[PDB]
């Protein structure tokens, strides 16, 4: 009381529950006090960040250095969460997700470390999660069958019929299969391996799909015994919870059983090359557009150790000056050259490895131009050495960091442990990464003392560095087909080596695993919260709405934004002609990048980066809460700035609204070719989303509109525009959109700032609103109470549709959508509970555990759309069959009252998630939900009973009772192709 204040009372040398205080440092710019502790007996390191933040986070970190691409530290990370000595029950992790009110619960495996973080606002929940995490990581039951499920296994297509052929299955096996569906991730992986070929960075830490089955159960157990010793661990906490409680728990449960060892886990320094290297690799074809401009090329430079914190901080800043924004050297040299479509993957500073590295290059080039690019990179470096950087860009970059430092997030503790992990992993000082005020200061001093400081740095690490790597990638049209071929051989090689005794054990063990996944077991050894631990009411959000200039509503919300101002504006699309609708996302993406007034796009970019934290526009479809076929369509303008630069931001908005430059045609093609490239590369990672959006297009007008704005239709459209030889006819569409959008006719605004700043904002905002012009196509328009004008399509008829996108993927993405009821319907709360209920107790088991898919479940949206989905699924038909078996299971009522409570806990853990000061209260501003509506809906979630779950499952999810929509992203499926009820695109 307070948290950062109490931490300063700790004396150096203080002994606390087996720990010793080694250092206490105040970091006022982050409102926290850092405390370093060491465990006396084990030598385990501890970092505690004391800050008055209720969202407390714990994390434990292990240095994991694999020497093969089996993915053993990744599979181990999955497997240690499958059972422990104190909690021997099956799957403690996934069970605790529904027995807690956490804000975060997960695990990650980097190249050379594994991280287990969780966060919660409930102190009792913290202890519960702390006991389960400590026991899982240090004392796991590493049962053979849990390894077969999460890693890889041999299994009959029907585990009960030993005459069926044996196949590969596993969660990680399919997790990594789909991970390398992303070509950028393929490129990124090979870059690191070729650039750092000496030690653990030369392998695939996550797992190479072809090398995963080379992993034995024994190697998994040996790897754990070698790397998961507390002497090889980093402990981390953040928040207001008493530190003493943590240390007492960590010591008495786990650390007490160990004694100091010297971990054989150090990553040696990469020995620098005397001569540069070139490598050529291959990837998968394009999804799904065009065929010669598809080569990716990159040049990479080896940098010093990240444990040298200031030089790392320096080179990271230098890396932003070199590649970030249209004023960066490599942007003008590579992007504006028209040779490619976008930067190569992993552009800029990469500080995950011990030695960081810099990369720059292009994708979407013709293979003949590879030397052209390399020469440009060569020429650009020479010019930077000779000319250096302008001071206003250095000021702009330092202004951005200032914003990143002052901004208030809800997952601050998670970002901090992630931001220090690499440095800490190699025995660096994580606290020195926190003193950003010092690094900024020293950086400024280093510039004032040496005007050629940055020029000599580029000279050292780019012009004189012989440790250069040139890597080029060209796609192979049969890449995944070739992969399957080798996979089929390794499979046969593994089956051939099986003895008759081996074959019986695989049958029996496989049958035992299937039994484990089906048999309902007890989880009472696990700690748990109850529904009584959920707060009955929410804290009221205080607002005041003022009509301004002369009847535009502006919403003011006083918040501890720490000297930050957040401005938002929403302009309706009701006056816009329907012909121009598909071009609105494109419009919004270039509106703030084409120049305004006397500012060209270069000059405009300089101001935005120097005065604001960013200004963006995006199209939104906001469904009504009481009518499925009612929605609000518009564009959300969002901007952010420091207290002092507020007038500049609103002046920028005024000029963008009154004089945007829709004439910069050359830069326009660059932005379009870049947006299209980025959209196509991100399809696999968001495949289930693109599947869900298509599946729901035929169910709701809003769903139909969302498909136009961000569906595959939008991806396909953007690609066509980027293929256009004459871009002018698209460019002429923008002024037409401008005259309907950029005015004050159909507008409302919101402001989030400190109460001390509020009166100053009321002026600048009001001045902005008066500087924009003043004075609907669809039947009808509804007025809904301070008035929003919504589009109603009361003759909308939902229609069943099934779609299969033929993608060259090794995995599938399935989505099934059902039209239910909206937010204010009492059955909506039941459906919300049911969705998580089905996920926790059915779909997760069928699709993920048995199937081997990486993700699978059900969710219910605000728009009343019930969606079932699978993510990186080796199956398609069997997945859909599981969708049907899930609703039949839901109708059977064969679930307990405890399962309902666990579903409630899971739901409230999501809706009661912490809200950043910048986002309160966007729910009122966007969807028009009062505190009254939310409390009513909150108490309905409380009143949800078993009979209401049976009634609502039979009322909406049954076959023929409601309208369904289906979509699949994945390779060709003969069964689907012979079904006339499926459409192939």
């Amino acid at each position: 009381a307070a948290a950062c204040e109490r931490a300063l009372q700790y004396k150096l040398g203080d002994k606390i529950h087996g720990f010793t205080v080694n250092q206490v440092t105040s970091v006022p710019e982050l409102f926290l006090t850092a405390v370093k502790l060491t465990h006396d007996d084990t030598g385990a390191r501890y970092l505690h960040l004391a800050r008055e933040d209720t969202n407390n986070l714990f994390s434990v970190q292990f240095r994991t250095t694999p020497m093969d691409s089996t993915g053993v530290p990744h599979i181990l990370q999955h497997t240690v969460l499958c059972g422990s000595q104190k909690y021997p029950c099956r799957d403690p992790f996934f069970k605790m997700l529904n027995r807690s009110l956490s804000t975060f619960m997960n695990a990650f495996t980097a190249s050379d470390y594994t991280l287990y973080p969780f966060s919660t606002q409930n102190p009792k929940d913290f202890q519960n999660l702390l006991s389960v995490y400590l026991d899982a990581t240090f004392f796991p039951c590493l049962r053979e069958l849990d390894f077969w499920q999460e890693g890889w296994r041999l299994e009959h297509e029907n585990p009960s019929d030993p005459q069926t052929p044996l196949v590969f299955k596993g969660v990680v096996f399919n997790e990594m299969k789909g991970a390398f569906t992303d070509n950028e991730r393929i490129f990124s992986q090979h870059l690191q391996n070729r650039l750092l070929p000496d030690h653990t960075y030369s392998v695939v830490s996550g797992g190479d799909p072809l090398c995963i089955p080379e992993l034995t159960w024994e190697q998994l157990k040996q790897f754990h015994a070698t790397h998961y010793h507390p002497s090889n661990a980093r402990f981390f906490t953040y928040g207001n919870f008493p530190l003493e409680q943590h240390l007492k728990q960590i010591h008495e449960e786990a650390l007490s059983k160990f004694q100091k060892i010297e971990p054989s886990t150090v990553v040696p320094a990469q020995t620098p090359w005397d001569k540069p290297r070139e490598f050529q690799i291959t990837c998968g074809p394009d999804s799904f557009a065009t065929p010669s401009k598809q080569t990716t090329v990159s040049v990479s430079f080896l940098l010093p150790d990240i444990t040298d914190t200031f030089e790392a901080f320096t080179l990271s800043l230098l890396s932003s000056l070199l590649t970030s924004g249209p004023n960066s050297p490599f942007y003008k040299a590579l992007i504006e050259s028209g040779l490619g479509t976008d930067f190569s993957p992993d552009v800029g500073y990469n500080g995950y490895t011990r030695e960081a590295y810099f990369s720059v290059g292009l994708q979407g080039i013709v293979e003949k131009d590879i030397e052209t690019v390399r020469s440009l990179i060569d020429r650009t470096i020479d010019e930077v050495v000779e000319k250096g950087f302008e001071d206003d860009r250095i000021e702009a970059l330092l202004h951005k960091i200032e914003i990143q430092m002052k901004h208030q997030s809800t997952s601050f503790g998670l970002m901090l442990t992630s931001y220090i992990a690499s440095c800490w992993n190699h025995d660096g000082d994580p606290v020195e990464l926190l003193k950003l005020g010092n690094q900024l200061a020293k950086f400024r001093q280093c510039l004032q003392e040496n005007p050629k400081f940055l020029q000599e740095k580029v000279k050292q690490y780019f012009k004189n560095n012989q440790h250069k790597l040139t890597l080029s990638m060209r796609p192979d049209d049969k890449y995944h087909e070739k992969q399957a071929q080798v996979e089929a051989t390794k499979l046969k090689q593994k089956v051939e080596a099986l003895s008759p005794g081996d074959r019986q054990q695989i049958y029996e063990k496989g049958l035992e695993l299937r039994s484990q996944q089906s048999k309902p077991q007890d989880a009472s050894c696990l700690p748990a919260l109850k529904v009584s631990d959920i707060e009955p009411t929410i804290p009221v959000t205080e607002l005041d709405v003022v009509l301004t200039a002369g009847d535009i509503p502006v919403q003011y919300c006083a918040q501890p934004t720490n000297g930050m101002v957040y401005f938002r504006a929403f302009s309706s699309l009701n006056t816009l002609p329907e012909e121009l609708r598909p071009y609105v996302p494109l419009f919004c993406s270039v509106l703030t990048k084409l120049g305004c007034g006397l500012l060209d796009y270069r000059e405009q970019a300089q101001q935005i980066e120097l005065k604001t934290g960013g200004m963006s526009a995006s199209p939104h479809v906001l469904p009504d809460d009481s009518h499925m076929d009612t929605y609000e369509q518009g564009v959300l303008f969002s901007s952010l700035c420091l207290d002092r630069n507020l007038p500049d931001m609103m002046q920028l908005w005024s000029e963008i609204f009154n004089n945007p430059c829709f004439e910069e045609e050359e830069h326009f093609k660059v932005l379009v070719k870049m947006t299209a490239q980025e959209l196509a590369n991100g399809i696999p990672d968001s495949g289930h989303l693109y599947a869900s959006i298509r599946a729901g297009r035929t169910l709701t007008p809003a769903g139909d509109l969302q498909e136009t704005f961000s569906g595959m239709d939008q991806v396909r459209l953007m690609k066509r525009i980027a293929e256009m030889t004459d871009i002018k006819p698209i460019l002429r569409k923008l002024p037409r959109i401008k005259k309907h959008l950029l005015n004050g006719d159909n507008m409302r605004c919101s402001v989030n700032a400190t109460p001390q700043q509020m009166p100053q904002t009321e002026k600048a905002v009001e001045d902005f609103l008066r500087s924009i012009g003043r004075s609907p196509v669809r039947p009808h328009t509804v007025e809904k109470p301070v008035i929003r004008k919504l589009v109603m399509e009361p003759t909308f008829k939902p229609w069943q549709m099934k779609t299969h996108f033929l993608m060259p993927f090794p995995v599938n993405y399935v989505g099934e959508c059902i039209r239910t009821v909206p937010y204010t319907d009492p059955d909506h709360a039941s459906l919300k509970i049911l969705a998580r209920l089905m996920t926790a107790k059915f779909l997760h088991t069928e699709i993920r555990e048995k199937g081997g898919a990486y993700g699978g479940g059900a969710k219910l949206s605000h728009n009343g759309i019930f969606t079932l989905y699978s993510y990186r699924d080796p199956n398609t038909i069997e997945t859909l069959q599981s969708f049907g078996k899930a609703v039949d299971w839901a109708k059977s009522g064969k679930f307990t009252q405890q399962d309902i409570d666990e579903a409630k806990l899971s739901v409230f853990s999501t809706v009661d998630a912490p809200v950043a000061p910048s986002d309160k209260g966007m729910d009122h501003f966007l969807y028009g939900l009062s505190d009254e509506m939310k409390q009513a809906h909150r108490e309905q979630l409380f009143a949800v009973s078993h009979d209401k779950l049976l009634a609502v499952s039979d009322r909406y999810l049954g076959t023929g009772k409601s309208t369904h929509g289906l979509a699949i992203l994945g390779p060709e499926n003969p069964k689907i192709a012979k079904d006339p009820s499926w459409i192939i695109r």
């Binding site: 990370q77 969460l81 997700l97 975060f104 997960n106 990650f108 190249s111 992986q189 993700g855 479940g857």
Partner: peptide, 9 residues
């Protein structure tokens, strides 16, 4: 709750 499935590369 959150972040159900566990990563990464």
């Amino acid at each position: 709750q959150k972040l159900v499935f566990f990563a990464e590369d």
